[PDB]
Design a protein around this nucleic acid. Structure first.
Ligand SMILES: [Mg+2]
Ligand SMILES: [Mg+2]
Ligand SMILES: [Mg+2]
Ligand SMILES: [Mg+2]
Ligand SMILES: [Mg+2]
Ligand SMILES: [Mg+2]
Ligand SMILES: [Mg+2]
Ligand SMILES: [Mg+2]
Ligand SMILES: [Mg+2]
Ligand SMILES: [Mg+2]
Ligand SMILES: [Mg+2]
Ligand SMILES: [Mg+2]
Ligand SMILES: [Mg+2]
Ligand SMILES: [Mg+2]
Ligand SMILES: [Mg+2]
Ligand SMILES: [Mg+2]
Ligand SMILES: [Mg+2]
Ligand SMILES: [Mg+2]
Ligand SMILES: [Mg+2]
Ligand SMILES: [Mg+2]
Ligand SMILES: [Mg+2]
Ligand SMILES: [Mg+2]
Ligand SMILES: [Zn+2]
Lengths: 148, 144, 129, 79, 85, 80
RNA sequence: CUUUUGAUGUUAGGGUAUUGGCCUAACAUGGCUAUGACGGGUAACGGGGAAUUAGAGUUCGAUUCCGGAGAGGGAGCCUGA
RNA sequence: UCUGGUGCCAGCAGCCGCGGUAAUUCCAGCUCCAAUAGCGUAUAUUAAAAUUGUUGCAGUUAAAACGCUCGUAGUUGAAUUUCAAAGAAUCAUUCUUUUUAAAAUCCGAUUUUGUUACUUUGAGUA
RNA sequence: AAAAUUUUUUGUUCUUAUUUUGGCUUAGUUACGAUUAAUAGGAGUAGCUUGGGGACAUUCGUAUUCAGAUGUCAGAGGUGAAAUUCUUAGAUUUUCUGGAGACGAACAACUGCGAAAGCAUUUGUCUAAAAUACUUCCAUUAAUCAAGAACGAAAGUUAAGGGAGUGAAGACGAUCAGAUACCGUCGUAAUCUUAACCAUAAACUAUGCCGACUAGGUGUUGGAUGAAAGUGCUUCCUUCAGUACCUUAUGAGAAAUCAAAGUCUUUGGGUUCU
């Protein structure tokens, strides 16, 4: 782990075959249409992948089509201005900041908030090094609450 | 790893550490300190001249028992006073109240030697004649 | 983190050889490991070896002949001129009549005798007795 | 020996520790009584899956494999 | 530039009265001269007008509070007790 | 920040014999820039030596290459 | 840290055997620095070299040759390539 | 482990030590050892010192892991893009000869096809 | 659209067309155009998943002590032995009713959680953290870190509260040659709460952090897979993550001893401090 002491190794592992399974019947066109329709309802890419795995029968999107979910989302200009994992980090930070504003003796929350903000700054630097964020993107710790 | 950096661009760190850690060596710090020109009666010389002021006797250390013969000398060079040992059997009888003597080190440059406590000097000449040639008693006589 | 795959491979080979294991496995592979293994094979220090294909970095199984004394890397790849080989081999090798010091050279990977034969220098990789 | 492990032993290790990594999950066809419809389902599902005709639950998410509705029959999808 | 290192607000008292007394004065008058949230209109524009009266500059409602702050913990606790019941 | 005059930084590695390793080093150079070019803090320029033009200037710029950085110009390391 | 009294640049002149804040006037706010600026110390002139060392290194070089500086301490000047 | 004198005195001894009435160590006689027209002593410096450690030290108890975590500079960073093949001259080995994608300069023939670090060979040098 | 030459309309001012250079709109054609998915990392989704992790509010227990009652009579405490002390104005002892402050026994372990310091009565509300499962998303986003930052037992300092028990200081009674001590009777600060400081401990595993490899057995805490005795719950098997112990090392040490303190004159995986 990056901060604590954990050493777990749980993960998913892909099969050896890279081609689509022989029993699958869909065409790439309606698969992309399903991606777009499902993203219109307000789901993140990871949620979209999970829903396609469970509610429809598609083991991997990249096996059927040739692209990944984020690329086909960006092909129509639908991707969010702020990447997903950074957004989740910001949401956690703002929630912790509110709770802390209510309770000034909770020392543990201060420690955890410091750790999350360090993570935010590191990820933001990485995204700014590529052209995925404007160069003058700062994350002030006071104006972040209104960032939808 | 073994506590050092071993990379192809880590020379400054190694250089600076070796520079800083050398000052913990006693020998290096003795030879490179600026105060040696000040706290040294000889001031870096190997020999010096002076005037005898007083004869004394000094006790030996605990397991031994004797009375060692020395003199007190005022240096011509800077006026300081030291104590020097007179070696030989009856060699103190060759020295008068205020003669001129060469003295040298005593073999352990900064340290006392053997049985005498706190003596680091040794007389070699008196009245411009050698102490050894005078103790041999067959070579020369004091310059009257 | 890893920081190197050659050092881990050679360390695993050395540890297995001290016990008489007749076979050992190397988890991460690379072209440099392949060239180094081929060179040890050429001098008759190991048997044949096999390359396994997963859709990630592959794996290797080698056959041992109870014949290696030591095989280690020199981690900082110092660059060596053609006329400095003598000092390095005097310091590193156990005799003047056997053992090999391996360099990477603009003409490929080779030991010190071949490097002298080709009139070239390079950077140091490792050695094996 | 090391190149040809016994497949009975290999099916007993962690999925990340066997010579070729292979998942333990699969896809399957589920036929629930009195519905006359075949639906594809994923072992280790995470959502609740409904029958297309009538909204009846086919599975329940858990911490491992999903729990199938009682009386249903399943069959693996071959490929 | 920063005009003062330590005393801040109490620089008007010069060198008189001793340093610890000026420290307590500073602690009190930071609270006394602040701005507070008006829970009726939502703006942060409530300021003290006398030793126990607080008035909002926007909606002009008057609230009875403490002497140097708008609320005091002893009243907060009693009110919370009653509301819980 | 001057009028028709810029400062450039050069990076290089220095070799130490006793430890068989290297170091990072730098030196600054004031140059003259003509109004025919358009530079900003972060670009790469090529300069040529001329006769003394002031107390500190002996080079002036002949070619500009657009380049984008992400921190401060004094913190980047490039060797060419 | 430097910059009132030239510190860093621009324009126009003066001066010199020539370039140059080398100097004068107007104008702009620059220049260096933890990769150690600005200071303190040296019983410090630099180098070709010397002593000891298996290989690494450690220490010395006022003094045959080359370069620099001075003629008790400072500052001015004539003749003259 | 020879002969006289002194007797914790006088003295010697770089270090360990010797000397209090039978001293192989002080003062002398004799005899031996070492280097030798040379041999002692003082101060500085090098090896000895893997006791300053890049090559090449040590950190539970001998000297030595910051009370603990975050963090900038610095140092260090997974795998992947042309891999081969077929001859000859050689006591299995060394040295080499042919080229199997593509595009731009001779009516299927010649040569050109990112920069540095790094390494090879030259020039110039009292 | 913008230009070099051909002739050109009569010694300098005098007329027209040529090819070629680069931008421009206009529709088609091309094998037209994107390396894995690390037993690296971050995010995500699921389980009536786990925990004495943190904050605020709230609830219960005997004990001790104060006060009011209650019944009876001569001692009670305390020590090696005694004294100081309390007591017919009723001590000590028993029974009941109220209030106060701290504390949370037994269960409780070579067991759990936390970066360390630390964390143990019930219930609610906030708040994070693992571990496991995964054919989810991104694609190198990482390791260690001078300067700098957060937290940091007990004691101690400032202010307002609280103040039963224990009790540095202090006062007594004993032992002793002396006893400013060890023993005993009182007892002030402190110990508890709220708001601020201080930055230290044998703050110890006297063992920095990340990665690889090397050996058998017995347990135990939390998930998951596969099989049997069941009134979709237990026992067994396999596997991941914590955590101990035993045996033995052609391994290591000066030894004690060590599963790392091993893979070191066969000496180099990365890095900070001394
Ligand atoms: Mg880290
Ligand atoms: Mg001026
Ligand atoms: Mg010289
Ligand atoms: Mg001199
Ligand atoms: Mg001379
Ligand atoms: Mg000269
Ligand atoms: Mg003179
Ligand atoms: Mg004799
Ligand atoms: Mg030495
Ligand atoms: Mg040495
Ligand atoms: Mg040596
Ligand atoms: Mg040592
Ligand atoms: Mg520690
Ligand atoms: Mg992965
Ligand atoms: Mg428990
Ligand atoms: Mg108080
Ligand atoms: Mg009390
Ligand atoms: Mg008491
Ligand atoms: Mg209190
Ligand atoms: Mg301490
Ligand atoms: Mg410690
Ligand atoms: Mg070592
Ligand atoms: Zn209001």
């Amino acid at each position: 782990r990056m901060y604590g002491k954990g050493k777990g190794i749980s993960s998913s592992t892909l099969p050896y075959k890279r081609k689509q399974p022989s029993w699958l019947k869909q065409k790439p066109s309606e698969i992309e249409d399903a991606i777009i329709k499902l993203a219109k309802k307000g789901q993140t890419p990871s949620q979209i992948g999970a829903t396609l795995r469970d509610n429809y029968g598609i083991p991997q999107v990249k096996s059927v089509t040739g692209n990944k979910i984020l690329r086909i989302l960006r092909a129509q200009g639908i991707a969010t201005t702020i990447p997903e994992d950074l957004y989740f980090l910001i949401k956690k930070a703002v929630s912790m900041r509110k709770h802390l504003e209510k309770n000034k003796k909770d020392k543990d929350c201060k420690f955890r908030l410091i750790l999350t903000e360090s993570k935010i700054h590191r990820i933001s630097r990485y995204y700014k090094r590529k052209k995925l964020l404007p160069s003058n993107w700062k994350y002030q710790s006071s104006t972040a609450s209104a960032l939808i | 790893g073994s506590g050092k950096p071993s990379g192809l661009r880590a020379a400054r760190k190694l250089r600076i550490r070796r520079r800083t850690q050398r000052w913990a060596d006693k020998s290096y710090k003795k030879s490179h300190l600026g105060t040696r020109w000040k706290s040294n009666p000889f001031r870096g010389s190997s020999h010096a001249k002076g005037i005898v002021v007083e004869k004394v006797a000094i006790e030996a250390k605990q397991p031994n028992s004797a009375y060692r013969k020395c003199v007190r000398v005022q240096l011509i060079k800077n006026g300081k006073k030291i104590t020097a040992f007179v070696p030989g059997d009856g060699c103190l009888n060759f020295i008068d109240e205020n003669d001129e003597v060469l003295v040298s080190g005593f073999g352990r440059s900064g340290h006392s030697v053997g049985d005498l406590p706190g003596v680091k000097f040794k007389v070699v000449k008196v009245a411009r004649v050698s102490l050894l040639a005078l103790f041999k008693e067959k070579k020369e006589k004091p310059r009257s | 983190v890893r920081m190197s795959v050659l050092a881990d491979c050679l360390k695993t080979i050395n540890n297995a050889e001290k016990r008489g294991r007749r076979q050992v496995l190397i988890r991460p592979s690379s072209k440099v490991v392949i060239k180094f293994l081929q060179y040890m094979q050429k001098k008759g220090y190991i048997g044949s070896f096999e390359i396994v294909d997963d859709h990630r970095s592959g794996k290797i199984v080698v056959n041992l002949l109870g014949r290696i004394n030591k095989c280690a890397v020199i981690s900082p790849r110092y660059d060596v001129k053609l006329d400095e080989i003598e000092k390095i081999i005097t310091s590193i090798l156990p005799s003047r009549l056997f053992g090999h010091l391996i360099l990477t050279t603009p003409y490929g990977i080779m030991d010190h005798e071949e490097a002298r034969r080709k009139h070239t220098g390079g950077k140091v990789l490792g050695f094996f007795f | 020996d090391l190149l040809n492990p016994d497949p009975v032993e290999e099916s007993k290790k962690h999925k990340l520790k066997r010579l070729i990594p292979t998942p333990n999950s699969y896809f399957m066809d589920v036929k629930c009584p009195g519905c006359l419809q075949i639906t594809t389902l994923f072992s280790h599902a995470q959502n609740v899956v409904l029958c297309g005709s009538c909204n009846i639950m086919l599975c329940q998410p858990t911490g491992g494999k999903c729990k199938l509705t009682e009386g249903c029959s399943f069959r693996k999808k071959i490929e | 530039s920063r005009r003062t290192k330590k005393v801040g607000l109490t620089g008007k008292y010069g060198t008189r009265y001793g340093s610890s007394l000026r420290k307590q004065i500073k602690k009190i008058e930071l609270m006394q001269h602040a701005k507070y949230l008006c829970t009726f209109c939502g703006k942060t524009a409530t300021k003290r007008t006398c030793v126990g009266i607080w008035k909002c500059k926007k909606c002009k409602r008057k609230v009875c509070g403490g002497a140097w702050s708008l609320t005091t913990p002893a009243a907060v606790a009693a009110k919370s007790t009653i509301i819980r019941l | 920040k001057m009028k028709r005059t810029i400062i450039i930084r050069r990076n290089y590695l220095h070799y130490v014999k006793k430890y068989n390793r290297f170091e990072k080093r730098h030196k600054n150079i004031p140059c003259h820039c003509s109004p025919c070019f358009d530079v900003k803090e972060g670009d790469i320029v090529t300069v040529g030596q001329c006769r003394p033009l002031s107390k500190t200037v002996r080079f002036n710029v002949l070619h500009v290459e657009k380049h984008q950085i992400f921190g401060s110009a004094r913190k980047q390391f490039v060797l060419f």
